[PDB]
Amino acid sequence: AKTTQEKFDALKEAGVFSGYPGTTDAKLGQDMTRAEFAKVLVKLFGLKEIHGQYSYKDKNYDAKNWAAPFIEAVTAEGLMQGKDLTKKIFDFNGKITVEEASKTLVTALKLEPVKDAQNKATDWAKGYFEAAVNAGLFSKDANPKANATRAQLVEAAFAADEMSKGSGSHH
Numbered sequence: 001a002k003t004t005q006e007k008f009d010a011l012k013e014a015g016v017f018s019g020y021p022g023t024t025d026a027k028l029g030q031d032m033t034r035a036e037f038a039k040v041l042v043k044l045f046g047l048k049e050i051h052g053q054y055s056y057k058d059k060n061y062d063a064k065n066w067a068a069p070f071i072e073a074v075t076a077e078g079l080m081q082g083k084d085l086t087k088k089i090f091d092f093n094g095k096i097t098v099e100e101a102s103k104t105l106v107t108a109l110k111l112e113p114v115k116d117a118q119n120k121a122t123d124w125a126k127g128y129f130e131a132a133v134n135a136g137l138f139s140k141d142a143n144p145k146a147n148a149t150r151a152q153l154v155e156a157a158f159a160a161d162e163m164s165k166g167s168g169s170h171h
């Protein structure tokens with residue numbers, strides 16, 4: 001097998017993962033912003049960046065925000081829609097949670113969310129989290145409501161990449 005560090009090294013070499021901001025380091029114990037995770041999804045699934053389009057009203061969500069082209073791409077793809085469809089808030093500085101990451105990866109991999117799942121996930125996420133656990137993207141002992149650690153996101157991204165390659169529909 002590969003260690004989490006080796007999985008990070010591989011994904012970094014592939015341009016999918018970056019160091020914890022301010023570093024080139026795995027920092028496997030640290031959290032990740034939804035902005036950073038949008039970029040991970042774009043690189044992981046080979047999505048096209050969308051420049052000069054703004055679908056959200058978050059403060060400092062504009063042409064000067066490095067994350068906008070990635071956030072627009074995952075929005076167009078239907079992987080993410082943000083946290084509030086009235087105020088159009090993505091919460092790009094918010095930390096990506098296990099169940100949020102579960103939704104994005106389940107959606108990207110075309111996996112069926114589990115109906116009437118019984119788990120500790122937020123109501124909207126129960127089916128997404130259940131499908132992610134069933135597919136081996138996260139452990140059943142992961143807290144769906146917790147901020148995902150970079151270790152959990154590296155393991156999930158690596159597993160998602162292996163599933164995509166093995167399905168014969170890799171980008």
Ligand SMILES: CO[C@@H]1O[C@H](CO)[C@@H](O[C@@H]2O[C@@H]3CO[C@](C)(C(=O)O)O[C@H]3[C@H](O)[C@@H]2NC(C)=O)[C@H](O)[C@H]1NC(C)=O
Binds near residue numbers: 079082083084101
């Ligand atoms: C009342 O609490 C709010 O409940 C919302 C809907 O039930 C919840 O919305 C979810 O947000 C998640 C954020 O991450 C992703 C991966 C995304 O698409 O960006 O998934 C989103 C869910 O689909 C859901 N969003 C909506 C608009 O219903 C808010 O996060 C949550 N807001 C906050 C501030 O925590």
